[PDB]
Amino acid sequence: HDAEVLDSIMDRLHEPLYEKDTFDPNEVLAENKQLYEEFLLQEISEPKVDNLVRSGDPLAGKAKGTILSLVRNSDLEDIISSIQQLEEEYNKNFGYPYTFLNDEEFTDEFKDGIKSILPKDRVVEFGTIGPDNWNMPDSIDRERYDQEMDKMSKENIQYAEVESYHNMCRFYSKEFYHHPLLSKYKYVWRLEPNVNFYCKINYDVFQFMNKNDKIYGFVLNLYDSPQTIETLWTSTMDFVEEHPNYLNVNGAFAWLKDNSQNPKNYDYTQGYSTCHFWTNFEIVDLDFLRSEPYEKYMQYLEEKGGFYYERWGDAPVRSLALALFADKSSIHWFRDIGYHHTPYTNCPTCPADSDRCNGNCVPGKFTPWSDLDNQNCQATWIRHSMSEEELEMY
Ligand SMILES: Nc1nc2c(ncn2[C@@H]2O[C@H](COP(=O)(O)OP(=O)(O)O)[C@@H](O)[C@H]2O)c(=O)[nH]1
Ligand SMILES: [Mn+2]
């Protein structure tokens, strides 16, 4: 990096995007909702690119990709519900395989249940995660963990004292892509139990990613609970000071530094908006996660112990890495993928004579609870992270 370029990136990473007192968060929220609405109420259909791979084209189905779910035996019914919707809106026409992972062994009744609801030719694989690749490591002082998570539960932080949740966040941050079953894939579509898909997708999504050089796909973009991640930003800035060469000059820096809608988030973390891609859905190019900057960052966070001493989610961790170490024009917003996971929905608008969406979601309604409208970070991403080529992609 040219030293001027780097200094300029470092200056932006060390100041708020908006100066104190030059904005009112209520007016910011209103303008952000209007910008969001202008996008969600725009009639769209499919990406406006000429290279889409249709069902039954020679490249259809040929990406090295899998639908991935980390689930418990007890999630069988809820994951089935998700799978049926993903098949109906997408995968029945493309036939990508499913990979299931669990920290316990899957039962035969789990496997049989999954198979009973899929076509006979659909490939399914089931894997167990080795205990050393899941459990709290020896580096952690369990008694400190207990005391930190006591304090945290008084603040009412969800799952603070659920050890499995900590393990999950860490596994989805830094380990899942090392599981042996995934060594043969370049792409994953992450699927969680109890989600909904609303709109038909008539192109191969992995091939779209590959052909248009996208490393990451998302649908929803949110603020996080700052008390789960008290020191994640400050640690991540220490890592970046030690490895400036990992910075991408076209990183999503404004999105990380936007203090205007939720200034108390930014103050609590001492410099991070807390905006993140909401990873319960994600399309991901595993070559990025396997790359030196991502793996080194993961090691650094492992050493800090914040997966256990705090409640660091996979979503902010993945999102910091993507924003700092990759070109933001490589991160695609799948406007067309109508999708819900409680309590939020991406519900796009179709042309009047289209039957592409099934009508089970209300277009543009992010959430039924207007108090949570200020948890939407999508306006920040639209305003600061999308250039002309992204803005005109739908
Ligand atoms: N195998 C396994 N899966 C887990 C465990 N805890 C969470 N998950 C899965 O990890 C994903 C995220 O967890 P979830 O409970 O949905 O958390 P939330 O979406 O963050 O509320 C989902 O696919 C869960 O099924 C666990 O202890 N074992
Ligand atoms: Mn979930």
Residue numbers in the entry: 71 to 464
Sentences from the paper on this structure:
Ktr4p is a member of the Kre2/Mnt1 family of glycosyltransferases. Ktr4p, as the other members of the Kre2/Mnt1 family, is a type II membrane protein with a short N-terminal cytosolic tail and a large lumenal catalytic domain of 40 kDa, which is separated from the membrane by a stalk domain of 11 kDa. Ktr4p, with its large central β-sheet, belongs to the GT-A fold class of glycosyltransferases. We used GDP-mannose as the sugar donor, and tested mannose, α-1,2-mannobiose and methyl-α-mannoside as potential acceptors; in the case of both donor and acceptor this was based on suggestions from sequence identity. Our results, shown in Fig 4, confirm that Ktr4p is an active mannosyltransferase enzyme.
We have formed the complex of Ktr4p and GDP and Mn2+ by soaking crystals of the apo-form, and solved the structure of this complex to 1.9 Å resolution. Both ligands bind in the previously described active-site cleft, which is situated on the surface of the protein, as seen in Fig 2. The most noticeable difference, apart from the GDP itself, is the presence of a Mn2+ ion bound in the active site of each monomer in the complex. The Mn2+ ion in the active site is hexahedrally coordinated. The metal ion interacts with the OE1 of Glu-262 at a distance of 2.2 Å, the NE2 of His-411 (2.4 Å), water molecules 1 and 2 (both at 2.4 Å distance), as well as the O1 of the α- (2.3 Å) and the O1 of the β-phosphate (2.2 Å). O1 of the β-phosphate interacts with the OH of Tyr-229 at a distance of 2.7 Å, and O2 of the β-phosphate interacts with the OH of Tyr-235 at a distance of 2.7 Å. The guanine moiety of the GDP makes hydrogen bonds to three residues of the enzyme via its nitrogen atoms; N1 interacts with OD1 of Asp-173 at 2.7 Å distance, while N2 interacts with the same atom (3.2 Å distance), OD1 of Asn-172 (2.9 Å) and the main chain O of Val-141 (3.0 Å). Only slight changes in sidechain conformation can be observed upon ligand binding in the active site, most notably the position of Arg-142 changes upon ligand binding to free space for the nucleotide base and interact with it via a stacking interaction, meaning the gross structure of the active site pocket is preformed in the proteins apo-state despite the absence of the Mn2+ ion. In the complex structure Glu-262 is coordinating the active site Mn2+ ion via its OE1 atom, while Asn-264 is on the surface of the monomer and is indirectly interacting with the second chain of the ‘dimer’ via two water molecules. Despite extensive efforts to produce a structure of Ktr4p in complex with GDP-mannose, both by co-crystallisation and by soaking native crystals with GDP-mannose, we have not been able to observe the non-hydrolysed state of the ligand, but only the GDP moiety.
